[PDB]
Amino acid sequence: LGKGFGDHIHWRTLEDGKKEAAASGLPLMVIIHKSWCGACKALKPKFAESTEISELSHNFVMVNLEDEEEPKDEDFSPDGGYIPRILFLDPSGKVHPEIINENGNPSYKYFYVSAEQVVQGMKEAQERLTGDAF
Ligand SMILES: [Cl-]
Ligand SMILES: [Cl-]
Ligand SMILES: [Cl-]
Numbered sequence: 120l121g122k123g124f125g126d127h128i129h130w131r132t133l134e135d136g137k138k139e140a141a142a143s144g145l146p147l148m149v150i151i152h153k154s155w156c157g158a159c160k161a162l163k164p165k166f167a168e169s170t171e172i173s174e175l176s177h178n179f180v181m182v183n184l185e186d187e188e189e190p191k192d193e194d195f196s197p198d199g200g201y202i203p204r205i206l207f208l209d210p211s212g213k214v215h216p217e218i219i220n221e222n223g224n225p226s227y228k229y230f231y232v233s234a235e236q237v238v239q240g241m242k243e244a245q246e247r248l249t250g251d252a253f
């Protein structure tokens with residue numbers, strides 16, 4: 120179910136994941152990716168091999184959406200249709216586009232290229248989205 124992002128991580132569908140998030144009070148982390156894309160291919164082993172990403176993932180409903188699993192919902196492309204994109208959602212299921220890859224390029228807010236960048240996004244989302252801190 121991880122599609123290369125790591126089989127030691129619990130992966131949910133978006134629909135099941137939103138149900139779990141609401142019931143557990145967990146934010147969601149949604150990774151949109153395509154099976155042909157070079158950026159997606161490159162990110163996968165970096166994500167899968169990160170102990171810190173795995174430890175942080177317990178605080179989220181983790182969702183990866185491959186190819187046609189991508190939502191037909193503009194909330195999931197706030198600044199463009201590049202891939203992969205990582206978006207964080209509150210437990211009620213709303214996308215929080217203000218949580219971005221701060222160490223990336225400002226034109227590609229949801230484009231993360233290293234495990235270290237992903238970890239920083241997860242840490243911010245955990246703090247901001249859990250318990251409606253925002
Ligand atoms: Cl491509
Ligand atoms: Cl690419
Ligand atoms: Cl390409």
Ligand SMILES: [Pt+2]
Pocket residue numbers: 155156157158
């Ligand atoms: Pt590509």
Ligand SMILES: [Pt+2]
Pocket residue numbers: 153185186187
């Ligand atoms: Pt597709």
